RNA sequence: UACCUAAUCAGAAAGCCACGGCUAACUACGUGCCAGCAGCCGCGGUAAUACGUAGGUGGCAAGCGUUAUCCGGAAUUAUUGGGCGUAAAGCGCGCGUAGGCGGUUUUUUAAGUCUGAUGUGAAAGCCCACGGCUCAACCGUGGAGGGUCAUUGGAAACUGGAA
RNA sequence: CAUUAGCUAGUUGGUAAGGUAACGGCUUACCAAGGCAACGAUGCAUAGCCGACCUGAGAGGGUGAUCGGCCACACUGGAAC
């Protein structure tokens, strides 16, 4: 635009909508209010453990878990790895990162953490997927 | 020392011993650099209210008079 | 010593001889590993920039974030960024000791500086990364002046670069001059590491 | 009241001090009025001290009161002597 | 309506130079007169002719081209525009094409070039870029 | 001797009654690292022959690039279609700060120190055309002084 | 307690991630659109350098990766530095108010503009130099820099005011 | 933030009196109808501010841990000695 049009109407940049919104909100049990926190991870309770069919191009039974976080927020989280020991009423640690196939899963359950075991036979890539150094 | 002086235009003389002086100045835009005209209204004291709406007058600051006035009328130069 | 590894496999993956002056790239001048003997593919721009950086880094035994930190100091100085970078590497105490001729290689000279056998300006300097300035004195510790390893290499060193005055008697050095690009290793393209860090 | 005192400017076990004219109520490393000089007690042998003369005698005439060791520092430059001469 | 007579002058030169016209005429002005004589002394145009008519006399400009019809003037750019004016200090005077081109600066010492303006250590309005 | 660099190799297709007659096109820039650079393209039925046609195409048209100590005489922005390449001369030790196809063009010429940015389309062919366009609009002090009837010192 | 001096031992002191392209690093085996991987392009359907493992390789290293958030790359709010025929974008068209901009010359003024001088923009910070810790981090000194700043001279082409 | 447009009535000015370290609607009486607002009054939401820090070639963008300057607060809310 012209300089005068810019002076009257300064340029407005676009706002950035962030992924993993449920990690950006805290809770205050005393005031019954939601806060803004920007947490790396959040801890929740598994209210449902099951398996989800993936998007159309792919075909594989993917394990997931419905997790109610520390907030009053109920999200769906992926379970990386082969074997998992999670049933209902399991405390998990949930990080960011979505699954492309699974529609409605925007988070990942951290393996090898509070009440979540690692992958039994993992030998290369043990930082991810939990599990300690064999021998 | 020295108290600041402004020159403006009388835009209100509906109150006794008080006039409103419009001191228009210039402020450049920080980003685009264009100078934009902006105006500021000053409420000034004049015991003998000889200023009439439309006069360019001389204004000098002083101690607080009333809730808003901080200026006195120094010189009237226009007639309108 | 940080690397503490195979100095042949590195010089085989890289294109230069690092330490040894040829003894490493004689029978197998190709890359190490299972796919080493077979033919080599072409290298992209990034592969060539990274290769040359690894050439100079493994030559001096420094690690990253210290190679990078030294590179950052070089840009501050006047002149060509690449030249002052290699000048600063040649001014390291562990490198000056080897180039003086006190040791027979780079790693051993580091252990001579590290274990405190040097006594720069008559004072114990056991930091391999000490930056030697022109007009100093790189001596040898009195109790270490009867070291067989030191005297085994003091005579076979022969050539000493012009920016280093070496005394065979009293086991002392001088660092008379700032090294020029000529005296520096000629197998390293300085302009290719400058471009790597600008990526 | 107004005090001529030392402000710590050193790291762990390596203290450096500035000779500063400051109010007594102000924090040690906080608000000040004027910097007068420096005091390094950990230098080679003798503690190297640097003091200005015009401002130091200006504040002393204005009623600033040196602390116990600023008195020593002002004495090693004869500042307290010349302050005494002008009775 | 006409708002920038100077920008019209530079565009007249730009348009005539593009089609390699040997000469052009434009209504004259004191500041437009000086810009023409700055370009003459800097070797961008051949000659400046000012003809006295009754009203706003005529400025005739004879453009210069080189051996292989090489347009001596490569481009013209109005810098200070009525919608946004540009003023520069002597310390931040711009160097058009690393000195291979002149910037017309109107200072208190008259309409001059950017090279010797730094010599007088004065600033003014950056009129146009000529390279 | 003219060093050659293959910029890009692209598999193109023409749909026929049978379907998808595949060809290969090659973009190659040639230069001498002394101030003569050129580009060309060629399409063959196989990759190794598309390069040779491109190399021959490039060697025909060479652009003389003026340069002062491995840097351009001044600042210029080359344009061709949607491609635009800004080119700033730099200090002796700077290096070639350039992107993709722009990097090959300047390296194959006698340019060793430049600051550049691709302010347009990233399509390789128009990037090269834009890069070449700036290099021919470049002017050295000698020519400019000659054109204006002045000495080089009179310019400065 | 730093620190120094004697003996003694290579002994007590490396792991993490990657290797399809972006992007440095490839083979074999197991499975067989399953198990699983994935930032995107996407891989996996009995001969996967893309999944798991084994060798090798490469990148770093007392750290290595993942997640969370900001700037960059993004010229993707374009003042520097974008556009509106067909990709998003010219209001259906007038009359018009504030505002923005405004033909040539002369005289004057000096608000902008330019050029000085003072006062201040604390200290600590950034950059440069120098010195001290065995080097470095760090520390200390000296400059520099930082304002739509205030007061006060000077210039008068341009913009502004007056005739 | 305009999908917040009209806000105030000690409000705004004056005249007296009081009291305040001090000017002043600071307060009280009596006069007049005034005062602010698309140059964003008001309202809503959010927030301690700055030197400074991160990022960027720069222009800019984000941030306000530790250190220093200022402000405000001391279980919540009033008051004075």
Curated annotation (Swiss-Prot), chain B:
Pfam families, alphabetized: Ribosomal_S17
Molecular function (GO) terms for this protein are: rRNA binding; structural constituent of ribosome
- Enumerate the Gene3D superfamilies for this protein: Nucleic acid-binding proteins (2.40.50.140)
Ribonucleoprotein keyword on record: yes
Q: Which GO terms describe its cellular component?
A: cytosolic small ribosomal subunit
Q: What is the role of the protein in this entry? A: One of the primary rRNA binding proteins, it binds specifically to the 5'-end of 16S ribosomal RNA.
Q: Which PANTHER family match?
A: 40S RIBOSOMAL PROTEIN S11 FAMILY MEMBER, SMALL RIBOSOMAL SUBUNIT PROTEIN US17M
Name of this chain's protein: Small ribosomal subunit protein uS17
- From which organism does this entry originate? Staphylococcus aureus (strain MW2)
Swiss-Prot record, chain C:
Give a yes or no for keyword Ribosomal protein in this entry: yes
**Limits of the S4 RNA-binding domain:** 91-154
Entry GO terms, CC: small ribosomal subunit
Q: Which GO terms describe its molecular function?
A: rRNA binding; structural constituent of ribosome
Which InterPro entries does this one have? Ribosomal_uS4, Ribosomal_uS4_bac-type, Ribosomal_uS4_CS, Ribosomal_uS4_N, S4_RNA-bd, S4_RNA-bd_sf
Checking NCBIfam families in the record gives: PRK05327.1, rpsD_bact
Q: What is this protein called?
A: Small ribosomal subunit protein uS4
Lineage of origin:
Bacteria, Bacillati, Bacillota, Bacilli, Bacillales
From Swiss-Prot, chain D:
One cellular-component annotation, GO: small ribosomal subunit
What Gene3D superfamilies does the record tag this protein with?
3.30.1320.10
A Pfam family this chain is assigned to = Ribosomal_S16
Q: What's a BP term from Gene Ontology annotated to this protein? A: translation
Q: Which UniProt keywords apply?
A: Ribonucleoprotein, Ribosomal protein
- GO MF assignments: structural constituent of ribosome
Q: So what family is this one in?
A: Belongs to the bacterial ribosomal protein bS16 family.
In its UniProt entry, what is this protein called?
Small ribosomal subunit protein bS16
Q: What is the lineage of its organism?
A: Bacteria, Bacillati, Bacillota, Bacilli, Bacillales
Gene name as annotated: rpsP
Curated annotation (Swiss-Prot), chain E:
GO aspect biological process, one term: translation
Q: Name one GO molecular function term.
A: rRNA binding
PROSITE patterns given for it? Answer: RIBOSOMAL_S8
InterPro entries linked to this entry: Ribosomal_uS8, Ribosomal_uS8_CS, Ribosomal_uS8_sf
Which key words are in the record? Answer: Ribonucleoprotein, Ribosomal protein, RNA-binding, rRNA-binding
A single GO CC term, please? ribosome
Which SUPFAM superfamilies does this UniProt record tie to the protein? Ribosomal protein S8
Which top-rank group of organisms is this from? Bacteria
> Subunit arrangement?
Part of the 30S ribosomal subunit. Contacts proteins S5 and S12.
Family statement drawn from the similarity comment of this UniProt entry: Belongs to the universal ribosomal protein uS8 family.
User: What is the purpose of this protein?
Assistant: One of the primary rRNA binding proteins, it binds directly to 16S rRNA central domain where it helps coordinate assembly of the platform of the 30S subunit.
- Under which name does UniProt file this protein? Small ribosomal subunit protein uS8
Origin species, per record, is Staphylococcus aureus (strain MW2)
Give the organism's phylogenetic lineage.
Answer: Bacteria, Bacillati, Bacillota, Bacilli, Bacillales
**Per UniProt, what is the name of the gene that codes for the protein in this document?**
rpsH
């Amino acid at each position: 635009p012209t300089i005068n049009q810019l002076v009257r109407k300064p340029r407005q940049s676009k706002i950035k909508k962030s992924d993993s919104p449920a990690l950006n909100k805290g809770f205050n049990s005393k005031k019954k209010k939601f806060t803004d926190l920007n947490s790396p991870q959040k801890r929740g309770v598994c209210t449902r453990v099951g398996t989800m069919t993936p998007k159309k191009p792919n075909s594989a039974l993917r394990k997931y878990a419905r997790v109610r976080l520390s907030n009053n927020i109920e999200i769906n989280a992926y379970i990386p790895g082969i074997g998992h020991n999670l049933q209902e009423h399991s405390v998990v640690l949930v990080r960011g990162g979505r699954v492309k196939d699974l529609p409605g899963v925007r988070y990942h359950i951290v393996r090898g953490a509070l009440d979540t075991s690692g992958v039994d036979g993992r030998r290369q890539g043990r930082s991810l997927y939990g599990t300690k150094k064999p021998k | 020392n020295d108290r600041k002086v402004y020159v403006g235009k009388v835009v209100s003389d509906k109150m006794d011993k008080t006039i409103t002086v419009l001191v228009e100045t210039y402020k450049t835009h920080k980003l685009y650099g264009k100078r934009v005209k902006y105006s500021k209204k000053y409420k000034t004291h004049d015991e003998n209210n000889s200023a009439k709406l439309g006069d360019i007058v001389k204004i000098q600051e002083t101690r607080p008079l009333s809730a808003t006035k901080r200026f006195r009328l120094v010189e009237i130069v226009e007639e309108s | 010593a940080r690397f503490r590894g195979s100095n042949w496999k590195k010089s085989r993956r890289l294109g230069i001889s690092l330490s040894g002056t040829g003894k490493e790239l004689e029978k197998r001048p190709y890359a190490p590993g299972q796919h080493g003997p077979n033919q080599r593919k072409k290298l992209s721009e990034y592969g060539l920039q990274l290769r040359e950086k690894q050439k100079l880094r493994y030559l001096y035994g420094m690690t990253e974030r210290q190679f990078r930190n030294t590179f950052d100091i070089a840009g501050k100085k006047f002149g060509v960024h690449g030249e002052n970078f290699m000048i600063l590497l040649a001014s390291r105490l562990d490198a000056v000791v080897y180039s003086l001729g006190l040791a027979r290689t780079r790693r051993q000279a580091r252990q001579l500086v590290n274990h405190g056998h040097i006594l720069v300006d008559g004072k114990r300097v056991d930091i391999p990364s000490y930056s030697v300035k022109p007009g100093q004195t790189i001596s040898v510790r009195e109790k270490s002046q009867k070291l067989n390893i030191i005297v085994e290499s003091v005579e076979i060193n022969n050539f000493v670069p012009e920016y280093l005055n070496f005394d065979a008697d009293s086991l002392t050095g001088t660092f008379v001059r700032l090294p020029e690009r000529s005296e520096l290793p000629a197998e390293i393209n300085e302009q290719l590491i400058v471009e790597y860090y600008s990526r | 009241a107004v005090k001529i005192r030392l402000t710590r400017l050193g790291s762990k076990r390596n203290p450096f001090y500035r000779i500063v004219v400051a109010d007594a109520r102000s924090p040690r490393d906080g608000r000040i009025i004027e910097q007068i000089g420096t005091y390094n007690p950990t230098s080679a042998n003798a503690p190297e001290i640097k003091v200005d003369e015009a401002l130091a005698l200006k504040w002393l005439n204005d009623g600033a009161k040196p602390t116990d060791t600023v008195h020593n520092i002002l004495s090693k430059e004869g500042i307290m002597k010349k302050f005494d001469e002008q009775k | 309506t006409m708002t920038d007579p100077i920008a019209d002058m530079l565009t007249r030169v730009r348009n005539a130079n593009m089609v390699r016209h040997e000469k052009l005429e434009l209504p004259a002005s004191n500041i437009k007169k000086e810009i023409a004589e700055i370009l003459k002394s800097e070797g961008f145009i051949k000659n400046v002719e000012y003809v006295e008519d009754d009203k706003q006399g005529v400025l005739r400009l004879f453009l210069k081209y080189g051996q292989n019809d090489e347009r001596v003037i490569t481009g013209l750019k109005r810098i200070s525009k009525p919608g946004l004016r540009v003023y520069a200090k002597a310390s931040e005077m711009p160097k058009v094409l690393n000195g291979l081109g002149i910037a017309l600066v109107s200072t208190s010492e008259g309409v001059i070039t950017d090279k010797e303006a730094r010599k007088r250590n004065v600033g003014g309005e950056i009129i146009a870029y000529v390279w | 001797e003219f060093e050659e660099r293959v910029v890009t190799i692209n598999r193109v297709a023409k749909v026929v009654k049978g379907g998808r007659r595949f060809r290969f096109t090659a973009l190659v820039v040639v230069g001498d690292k002394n101030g003569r650079v050129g580009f060309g393209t060629g399409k063959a039925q196989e990759v190794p022959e598309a390069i040779k046609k491109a190399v021959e195409a490039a060697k025909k048209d060479l652009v003389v690039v003026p340069r002062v100590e491995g840097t351009t005489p001044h600042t210029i922005t080359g344009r061709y279609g949607s491609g635009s390449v800004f080119m700033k001369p730099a200090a002796p030790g700077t290096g070639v700060i350039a992107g993709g196809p722009v990097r090959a063009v300047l390296e194959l010429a006698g340019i060793t120190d430049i600051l550049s940015k691709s302010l347009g389309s990233n399509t390789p062919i128009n990037m090269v055309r834009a890069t070449i366009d700036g290099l021919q609009n470049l002017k050295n002090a000698e020519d400019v002084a000659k054109l204006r009837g002045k000495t080089v010192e009179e310019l400065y």
